[PDB]
Structure formats: structure tokens, C-alpha cells
Design a protein around this ligand. Structure first.
Ligand SMILES: CC1=NN(c2ccccc2)C(=O)C1
Ligand SMILES: [Zn+2]
Length: 140
């Protein structure tokens, strides 16, 4: 579980979005596993605006923060899970690391801010859904 709170936006894994998220939807993309909803409170996370390929992510299933190298966001095939069938996920960054389903929502961060959220796992890789291309998250 986990979310990005930036301005009046909540960024969550699409597959973990709640009733309230869908009732307050701003934007969602299944191919990216992202959903943004609106919030009453003004959050403080800052989105990274960079092409960093190094960061630290939080892994709930190890209660650990891991420094990682990750690939630039790309179109990646991802085997079937409990929420999606085997399919190409877009804007996905891979790293060597630990990722179980409940690790989804863990944040990947660089010195510039939030890079993305855990979205995929298995075969010793962790996949993060990039948010650095969503410029509109910084305004309105
Ligand atoms: C929210 C959270 N952000 N993080 C975090 C902290 C440092 C680097 C990357 C991610 C947590 O462990 C929980
Ligand atoms: Zn960065």
C-alpha cells in the first residue's frame, strides 16, 4: 500500500484505488497502473523533474529502504497478476530488488523528489510506475 500526496492530488496504484478515489477521480491509466484523485488537504510531496536512474525505494515486505539503479521508463511486458492479465505496462522502470504484491505503493525517490511508486514484482525485479512525466501534478 501507499500514495503520493502532492498539492491537492493523491497518486495511487490504479489496482488499489478505493471507492473515494473513483468518486474523486482526476486521471487514471490502466496501461500505467496509475490513478490520481483530488484531496481536501494540500500534501507536501514534490515530484522529481529529472532523468535520474538512481534512487532509494521503500519495500514494506522487508521493512527496508534499498538504493537501486533503474531503467528509464519504457513499455514492458508484465506477466499476469491478481489484478491484471499478462500485458504491456507503459512508463515502467525496472530495478533488481524485492517486490511482493503488498509492496505496491512504496515510493522511489531521488534528490529531486518522488520518481514513482512500486507497481510490479517477481523474478527478483521491482517495477516502478514513473510519475516524472506528469507535469500537471505540480499545478492547479
Ligand atoms: C511514504 C514513504 N516514503 N518512504 C521513502 C523514504 C525514503 C526513500 C524512499 C521512500 C518510506 O519509506 C515511506
Ligand atoms: Zn532525480
Amino acid at each position: 500500500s501507499g500514495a503520493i500526496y502532492v498539492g491537492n492530488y493523491r497518486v495511487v496504484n490504479r489496482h488499489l484505488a478505493t471507492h473515494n478515489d473513483w468518486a474523486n477521480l482526476v486521471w487514471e491509466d490502466s496501461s500505467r497502473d496509475l490513478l490520481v484523485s483530488s484531496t481536501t488537504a494540500q500534501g507536501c510531496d514534490t515530484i522529481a523533474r529529472c532523468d535520474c536512474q538512481t534512487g532509494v525505494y521503500y519495500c514494506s515486505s522487508r521493512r527496508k529502504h534499498y538504493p537501486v539503479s533503474f531503467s528509464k521508463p519504457s513499455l514492458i511486458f508484465v506477466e499476469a497478476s491478481e489484478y491484471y492479465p499478462a500485458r504491456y505496462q507503459s512508463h515502467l522502470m525496472l530495478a533488481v530488488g524485492h517486490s511482493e504484491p503488498g509492496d505496491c505503493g512504496g515510493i522511489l525517490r531521488c534528490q529531486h523528489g518522488v520518481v514513482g511508486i512500486v507497481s510490479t514484482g517477481g523474478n527478483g525485479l521491482v517495477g516502478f510506475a514513473d510519475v516524472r512525466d506528469l507535469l500537471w501534478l505540480d499545478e492547479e
